[PDB]
């Protein structure tokens, strides 16, 4: 009932290894329209068929695959993820399993001791606006479909190039051929424009936490007053906590605690990081259920 | 709905690590009678305390722990299992996580490239019985019971030393003064004994599956025909397959295959085994649901 539970949870290389290495010579897509047997099966891989068949039933196990008669195979819905259609949840597997994620884990004991576009911002209302500057833009994506969206509001950008710096046709590309207004190099900078409106998106996301507070030190130490700093972020449950979803937040806090970076702030720890930061609160507002994307907008 | 499954599934290292590095400090053990806050934690810990509390979270999250109020936090019943009583399910965890297991599991898709004492065995019965041979006994555990149960009955083993060969004051603590006949050896030697009834327990489970033929064709080269073979093993589900339970057959098969040589055999995968190994079937018999325990007997 309950050791269930736990060794479900301690056996989770178990789980994890089994379904990277199912993709990593796509067994899926074998079974897409149909493939019987470990021997069929075993010619298109390389590998054992004896030892490979302990690996069929721990996938069969975890659901994902379903033998239906004695020994031949086929595979279930979840297992249709894992092709490269839809969804292709499985390019996730691999890079969260290969020794870049998996091996740096391993570990990530020590480390505890020491494409996205908003139209969401379309319910932010840029409605009586005329300028905007997106701090540390890069791929222009949303940069392109706000002044695409609003016909008369004009807007900049800067970050370094060999940063997904290919604006070149996307602010161009897609109407907006004069508010491209670009600059270059980082934000550690203090930044020249005093502009109107700040746009900052997922980047405490990139940032760590002090980072975060000296590259908001460089917005306003010469940001142009009364007017507003948007930061689109993912946050963490201040809400409260739960289990059902939620989960992606706390799993990437400690895939970027190893995996780069990242860390999670709530909505408090925004709030602070805001008000000695140079930055007033304001209104917060977030996504549907599904996600935690949240708007803050501090004045 | 079915990405929660399959995310859940590929984030095994998420949930298997922060278990083990939450006992690594048993932390539990704080919370046992009662404690607070991460700043009071902390204390008694080393690390961070405020990248320690993204961890906090990660456990209460996967339920093992649970905040009752901001900030402070309590455990839960199966955060109950982490302390070092009753079950003590953490000397698992703490072996399966460390890098002997977690590190080995990592490039394991290579591999795949290339204290239990039956009492369940006086159901068997040996009831009109004389003579046994215990194949690599060891600890003398159920040579004790069985030769304890039947007073007349009596027995021999052979183990090599310093394979938990304490035998010393357990065939001797506990009646069986007579009835030792101990030798000494591995199973690879051919056997001398040809004596009524030969005992191999969860055997399989440590060998490979052409070592299993073999130490079997080390028996009937020289064993006393028209007598018993018993060998209690773990067997794997032939019965169908399943999800719930089960589990501990399929995740140890794999862990084997990793943490040394174990590998589970069906009913017809030891069937055929014996067939052709010089054994010859006869009735099988498991443990209750619970467990995959089996005795299997042939003649
Ligand atoms: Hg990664
Ligand atoms: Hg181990």
């Not at 939620?246 to 806090?253: G, I, L, R, S, W």
């Not at 970027?256 to 140079?278: D, N, P, Q, S």
Request: some cysteine; glycine content about 8%; aromatic content about 6%.
């Amino acid at each position: 009932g309950l050791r269930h539970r736990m060794q479900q949870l301690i056996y989770g290389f178990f789980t994890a290894q089994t379904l990277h290495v199912a993709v990593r010579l796509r067994i899926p897509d074998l079974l897409a329209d149909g493939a019987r047997d470990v021997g069929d099966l075993a010619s298109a891989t390389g590998a054992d068929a004896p030892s490979l068949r302990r690996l069929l039933r721990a996938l069969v196990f975890l659901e994902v695959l379903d033998e239906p008669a004695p020994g031949t195979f086929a595979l279930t819905e979840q297992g249709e993820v894992l092709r490269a259609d839809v969804t292709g949840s499985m390019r996730e597997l691999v890079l969260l399993l290969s020794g870049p994620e998996s091996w740096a884990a391993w570990g990530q004991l020590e480390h505890s001791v020491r494409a996205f576009v908003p139209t969401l911002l379309s319910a932010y209302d840029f409605g009586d606006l005329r300028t905007v500057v997106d701090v540390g833009g890069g791929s222009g994506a949303l940069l392109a479909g706000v002044l695409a969206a609003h016909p008369h509001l004009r807007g900049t950008v800067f970050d370094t190039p060999d940063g997904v710096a290919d604006a070149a046709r996307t602010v161009a590309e897609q109407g907006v051929a004069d508010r491209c207004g670009v600059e270059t190099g980082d934000f550690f900078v203090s930044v020249p424009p005093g502009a109107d409106a700040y746009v900052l998106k997922s980047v405490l996301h990139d940032w760590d936490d002090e980072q975060c507070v000296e590259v908001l030190r460089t917005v306003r130490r010469a940001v142009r007053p009364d007017s507003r700093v948007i930061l689109v972020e993912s946050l963490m449950p201040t809400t409260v906590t739960t289990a059902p979803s939620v989960a992606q937040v706390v799993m990437n806090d400690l895939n970027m605690m190893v995996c780069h970076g990242g860390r999670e702030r709530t909505v408090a720890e925004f709030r602070e990081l805001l008000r000695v930061a140079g930055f007033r609160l304001e209104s917060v507002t977030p996504c549907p259920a599904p996600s935690v994307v949240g708007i803050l907008e501090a004045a």
